[PDB]
């Protein structure tokens, strides 16, 4: 076969150990999930780090401790549509319950008359997105190092019946050791089987989402294919100026690859970017192991990635606490808190 006796035995033992880890991880998650901490004037607001549908993420400094954090601010009155509301409650509840080396750590959450707030560990190395756009494309070893972290993170999340649903370089922060921290759980959801919301980012949507079919955690494995392609090419596989054109390319079942992609990479990507769910890697009887045991990952020491023992492709420059040099600049808008409580009943559980 492809493996000798000793290699095969090592892999099987490795798989029993994964099972053991995931069983303990589920016990720990469920305790926090069933039983889900600060105030706005406890922080100085420093700089906007990014902006989105409902608000912004700011660097903030905790006044008493001096620790820096990323604060996501959501304007309750912008969170108006039904699935925008439910998604915000998903995000907070999931973030407070998970624990994994490549997932950002939530430290505080609170609300006031106008806004919802989630305060997370600050990751100063910047978004994968801007490093990727600046350099053009990552080498295959570099892309593989980041991809391995996403594979392990999705194996963790999926074992908890969590779907992530917004993988993209914008959502992947690089920490001081050069490893990934996934942020933004605004589209994540606990799903036992299928779910039906039409949501995500156009370039990263699986065909079954676009086609209004009930879908499952395999949409994350499709998105991994898009991510790996974009990291290694510098642009995603379904690339057009308008969402409707992107959707048409996704559904077609066609993908073209740069001539510099290795054949191992193309093989992996054809099996992730697979429109037929009975054939998509991650979704078959051997689950995530079809991905982890693929030839493109043959040099990957999965346990060593998890333990953060592997040397990273690069280490972001950092000048000290609160350095924002690895982030782009955004227009600053003052945080106004109304004297009247807004949308109190829609956000009771937050």
């Amino acid at each position: 076969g492809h493996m000798g006796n000793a290699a095969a035995a090592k892999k099987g033992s490795e798989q029993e150990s994964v099972k053991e880890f995931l069983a303990k991880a589920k016990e720990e998650f469920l305790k926090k999930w069933e039983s889900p901490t600060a105030q706005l004037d406890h922080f100085d607001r420093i700089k906007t780090l990014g902006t989105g549908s409902f608000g912004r993420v700011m660097l903030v400094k905790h006044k008493e401790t001096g620790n820096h954090y990323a604060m996501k601010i959501l304007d309750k009155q912008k969170v108006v549509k039904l699935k925008q509301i439910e998604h915000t409650l998903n995000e907070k509840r999931i973030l407070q319950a998970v624990n994994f080396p490549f997932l950002v750590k939530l430290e505080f959450s609170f609300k006031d008359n106008s806004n919802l707030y989630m305060v997370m560990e600050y990751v100063p190395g910047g978004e994968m997105f801007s490093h990727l756009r600046r350099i053009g494309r990552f080498s295959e070893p570099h892309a593989r190092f980041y991809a391995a972290q996403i594979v392990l993170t999705f194996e963790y999340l999926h074992s908890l019946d969590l779907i992530y649903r917004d993988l993209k370089p914008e959502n992947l922060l690089i920490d001081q050791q050069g490893y990934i921290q996934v942020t933004d759980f605004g589209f994540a959801k606990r799903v036992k089987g299928r779910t039906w919301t039409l949501c995500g980012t156009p370039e990263y949507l699986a065909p079954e989402i676009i086609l209004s079919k009930g879908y499952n955690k395999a949409v994350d494995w499709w998105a991994l294919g898009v991510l790996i392609y974009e990291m290694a090419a510098g642009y995603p596989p379904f690339f057009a100026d308008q969402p409707i054109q992107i959707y048409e390319k996704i559904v077609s079942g066609k993908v073209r690859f740069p001539s510099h992609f290795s054949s191992d990479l193309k093989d992996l990507l054809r099996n992730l970017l697979q429109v037929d769910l009975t054939k998509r890697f991650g979704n078959l009887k051997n689950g995530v192991n079809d991905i982890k045991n693929h030839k493109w990952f043959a040099t990957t020491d999965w346990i060593a990635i998890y333990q953060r023992k592997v040397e990273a492709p690069f280490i972001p420059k950092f000048k000290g606490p609160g350095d924002t040099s690895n982030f782009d600049d955004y227009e600053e808008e003052e945080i106004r808190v109304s004297i009247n409580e807004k949308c109190g009943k829609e956000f009771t559980e937050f």
Partner: peptide
């Protein structure tokens, strides 16, 4: 030709 800037996720297409 395609989108090169940051991409917004859509909560309800």
């Amino acid at each position: 030709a395609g989108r090169t800037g940051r991409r917004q996720a859509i909560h309800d297409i």
